[PDB]
Structures are given as C-alpha cells and as structure tokens.
C-alpha cells in the first residue's frame, strides 16, 4: 500500500476469473475498450467502476451462478484525469 496508490484487481475474493480466450481476457478487453472511448475524458475511478459493471454482466461446467467481479482500491487524494497532453 501507499499514498496516492490505485490498486485495480481483475477479480475480487470469493469470485472466479474467466479463462483466457484468443481475443484476450474479459478484464483487459473491457478495460481497454473503456480507455479507448472514455480514457481521455472520464475520471479514472469512474472508468474503473464501468469495468466493474461490464465484466460482472458477462457470462460464459455445471457451476452456473457465476461471474467475475473485479475490484479497485483507491488511496488517491484527488480526481484522476488523463486529458490529452500538449
């Protein structure tokens, strides 16, 4: 841990992470999708919160009631934006 740290976890405790497909993994795919569209404007924890929804709504082995639920832990002190640099 540390001041102004941001820990973005692909899967939280007590939850199952999906298998690696040919097109990548769910977490990174969705993370990267959101960065592509919302990265330059949105506040990064708001963006991470979108990924939490996107991956938690994804579905694929008789264990059915099952989703990957990511998690982020913020020790940020301010809002984080990646506005285009000059």
């Amino acid at each position: 841990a540390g001041a102004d740290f941001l820990m973005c976890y692909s899967v939280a405790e007590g939850y199952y992470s999906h298998r690696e497909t040919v097109n990548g993994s769910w977490y990174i795919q969705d993370l990267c999708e959101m960065l592509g569209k919302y990265g330059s404007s949105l506040e990064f924890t708001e963006l991470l919160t979108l990924v939490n929804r996107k991956v938690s709504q994804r579905r694929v082995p008789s264990a059915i009631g099952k989703k990957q639920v990511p998690c982020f832990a913020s020790m940020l002190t301010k809002k984080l934006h990646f506005f285009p640099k000059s």
Binding site: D4, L6, N23
Partner: protein, 133 residues
C-alpha cells in the same frame, strides 16, 4: 478546499506504463493462451500509448535480463512525469508454483515505490493493474 480538485497532470511527459508478463514456471502453455496474452499486451500497449504513456514491456523467462530490467526501472527519475502505471499479467489456470511466484513478484513490484521510497513519484498517482488468480 476544492471538492473537485484534480491531480496536477501538467508535466512534460505522462510517465512510464510498465507491462509485466509472468511466464516462468508455467508448463503446457496453450496456443489460445499465447494469443490471448499477446492480445492483452497489444491492446494495453495501444490504449496507454494513446493516453501519452511511454509503454515498456518485459517478462521473467530469462533470469539475467530480469535483474537488468528491474534495475533499469528502479533508477528512473519520474520528476517530469504525471504518474506511474504498472500492469501485472499472469495466466488463468496455473500450478501452485506459478501462483506462488506471482504473489512474491507482485509484492516486489509494489514494494518498490510503496511507503514513499521513489521520491520523484511522491504526491503522484501510482496505478497497479493486477491480473492474478
């Protein structure tokens, strides 16, 4: 006191985006997994580059080059950088040894910077994206 205060992201560079792949001690690497891992690294490299980041990738397959690569990153000044990003990537289903090595590696990578050792990143966002199981 501003309730909508943002980090000052007005430095010369955005900073380094470190893309680490945990490969060693993984036996029977499937083709699809090899493609997926490449897809994740590539996608992450494209998206962070467009956000201004100087992306640097490396893995742990070779023992010597690893020590040299960690050394390289440990002695970089982030004085003119907005922030630091480190992505740890590791395969889904892997043996007890693989999962253990991941944990030790994650603590090592976060152990640097942590508290506030890296003084040039003091007061700056330090972002760790971790895909372990």
């Amino acid at each position: 006191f501003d309730p909508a205060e943002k980090y000052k992201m007005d430095h010369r560079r955005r900073g380094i985006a470190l893309i680490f792949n945990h490969e060693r001690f993984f036996w029977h690497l499937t083709l699809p997994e090899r493609r997926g891992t490449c897809a994740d690294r590539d996608n992450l490299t494209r998206r962070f580059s467009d956000l201004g980041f100087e992306v640097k990738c490396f893995n742990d397959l070779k023992a010597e080059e690893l020590l040299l690569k960690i050394h390289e990153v440990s002695t970089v000044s982030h004085a003119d950088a907005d922030c630091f990003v480190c992505v740890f990537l590791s395969h889904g289903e892997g043996n007890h040894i693989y999962a253990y090595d991941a944990k030790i590696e994650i603590q090592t990578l976060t152990g640097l910077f942590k508290g506030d050792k890296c003084h040039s990143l003091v007061g700056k966002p330090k972002i760790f994206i971790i895909q372990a199981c």
